Amino acid sequence: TVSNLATMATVTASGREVSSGFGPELAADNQDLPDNPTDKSVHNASGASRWSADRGSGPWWLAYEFPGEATISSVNIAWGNTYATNYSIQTSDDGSNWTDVKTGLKATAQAQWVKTTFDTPIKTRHIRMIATTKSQSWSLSVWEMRTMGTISAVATDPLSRLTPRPLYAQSADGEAFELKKNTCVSVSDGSLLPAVDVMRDELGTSYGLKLAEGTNCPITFTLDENLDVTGHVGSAQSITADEAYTIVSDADSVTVKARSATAGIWAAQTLLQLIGPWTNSTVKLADVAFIPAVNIADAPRYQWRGVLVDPARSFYPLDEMKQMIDVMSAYKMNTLHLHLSEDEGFRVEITNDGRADGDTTDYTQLAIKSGAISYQSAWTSNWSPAQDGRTGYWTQSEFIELVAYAADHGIAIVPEIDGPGHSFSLLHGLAELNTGNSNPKPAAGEDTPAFIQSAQGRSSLATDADITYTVLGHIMDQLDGMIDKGIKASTMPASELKRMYFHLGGDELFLSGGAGNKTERLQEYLGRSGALVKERDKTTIVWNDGLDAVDQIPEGSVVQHWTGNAANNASIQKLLNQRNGKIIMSPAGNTYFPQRPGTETTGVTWACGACTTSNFYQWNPTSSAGTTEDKVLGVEDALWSEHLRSLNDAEFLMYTRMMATAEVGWTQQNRKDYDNWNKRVGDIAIDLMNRGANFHKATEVTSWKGSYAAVDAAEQKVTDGKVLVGRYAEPGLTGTDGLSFTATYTAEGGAVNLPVTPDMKQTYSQQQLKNGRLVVNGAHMNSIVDVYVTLPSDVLAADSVGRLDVSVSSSTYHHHHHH
């Protein structure tokens, strides 16, 4: 049973002919046409039951906001004496962003019903008719827009933005908490100050909040090592309780409980998602920030939620690593796996401080010599950039700073020094490692092997030589010392942030050829190296193609799975079932960022053809591992850098797929829904535009949206009458001509027109090729649009008193703002 829901709708329109009658609400009054509806005395009787639109060039639109989710079967429009010769019907969840549901619609006569049927009824809070052309110069005329269906009186979900989707989240009673400039925060413990710092780092700029630590503040964080959310853990669910938090908020208070300092940062990240996708605004906004009234209880499914970054192929400066850490933290990733060494580079300084007794190795050569090499474009015959990998390395100071910044965002460092293959940078850097069964050998009269194409994929450390293990042990000791110093600088607890794991690699030894004995080499090397990790009170990690040494690595070692089917891999099952091992899941087709994210893009094709947000989301790491939940540590994305030369190009591949892995890492298997995640991507993107982070504008994402935010003009420079009053963020804009801006000013008493200048520094571009090779930074997002107005002299010269109105319209967006 359907009804005309027009009669319960809140009705808006592009405009109206006259202020006094023919209002848009007269399309929504469920009245049959009067007798003789085309007669002018009937169509133009002052009380005629019809909308008469604004004039001008259009488009002209009529929008219904339902008090609930409407399930709409059909729209039947009774057109008046001026009818739409071309129109569409669009839907909106938010009332501002519109999506086509029926296009190519036409009326063909006066006083004509045009019925548009949805064979599958559509569920929507908003619907509108938008018309581009009409039958006469007169105002478009609508007697009736009947929207036939049923309605469910469900309120908007103030928690709909959250990613990852929490364990438990429900709206609470009453108004939102309004954040004020001097709103203070109380913590139970100093280790929670980093969580408040994360909030202040965004909100200080975007909303001018001090968020000072105070006493008896209305926002509190409490560390409770016994926090229990198991009430919300169902028999088919599984959590890591150490990262549990709760939030309980109302109009007067925001109360956070955290099981760990790390969980306090997760709580802060949740609060920043609730405040909305403008918290990283580089400019003070005019709107106040609100935390809606909520009850949240949250913890992750998996304890290990990571990103591998490979600076070894192409270096990433410290400031770029910080921008990665910011977004990793924003999605509750807790692990930064650094692939520090490769055939093509070594990216951290190792000193001669604290060497073992008898060790006179000169470690300073390693960064000096092997920092200076990188992936060679000339050794590629493909679409890889013409530019070689970036060279360089983090100094110990910068590496300690990297550790501290990661820790202050809830992220631990997991170092990898790959061997015995993928190790040419070590041989190239340290004369002393060129001994025993190492490969390749230095040319006659040389103390280190030449960085030439024939070395690549043919490297082996000397698995038979004591110096190999001396060197590895020193590098482990140096990394540990730097990690300890960075955690100390962060103030986060070492018990939380010092990840007692070391990644030995073990992958693809002699992939391109080399000296043979592949298996006997893995077994000797990973046996002795594993013993180094164990004696340092750590758990060994190896890639799955190093489990040739499953029996020689320590009991309880971890496999990082990337290649083939883990569930059928005998050596993985042996580790997990016979050697109390655990698994980190990085199957290439679900987690490898170089795998091209769309069929329109240029990139690696082998794992999926294109591994999209669907491939990154729609998998279950435990069933992919073919093991039990208890044996799965979690997941890591991989950013391999053979082809990456910039943070912009890395972020193209990382985002938004990384936010799918974040949900796989955190969200319960039975709470995952790819369509629900997909709907959340639009605001994920508005926040990335505010951060200045790049992202692939994937075709399978269907929530790309615009968002208008008013700017606090009091903090903006006026130049020759021109001042920034608004920003408009929409991924994919190639220019501003699709957008119509209008602004008016009213001093109390007075509305005058302000001419608007929209200004977008950069346009959207997909990847660019030159001579068959990707151009570095070819794919880049458009800028947020700056919305300037030019003030008249009387307004320019007035003191501080008035109301600014700004309206933005496109075929897919409409918003009117006032302050």
Ligand SMILES: CC(=O)N[C@@H]1[C@@H](O)[C@H](O)[C@@H](COS(=O)(=O)O)O[C@@H]1O
């Ligand atoms: C205020 C008022 O009466 N305005 C009406 C309009 O709404 C109408 O669209 C127009 C043409 O009417 S038609 O019947 O010839 O198309 O005539 C009058 O201008």
Ligand SMILES: CC(=O)N[C@@H]1[C@@H](O)[C@H](O)[C@@H](COS(=O)(=O)O)O[C@H]1O
């Ligand atoms: C463990 C591991 O992945 N080892 C190697 C990495 O040295 C390589 O860099 C990466 C490329 O990823 S791809 O570009 O997505 O194929 O894949 C594997 O070849």
Ligand SMILES: [Ca+2]
């Ligand atoms: Ca009517």
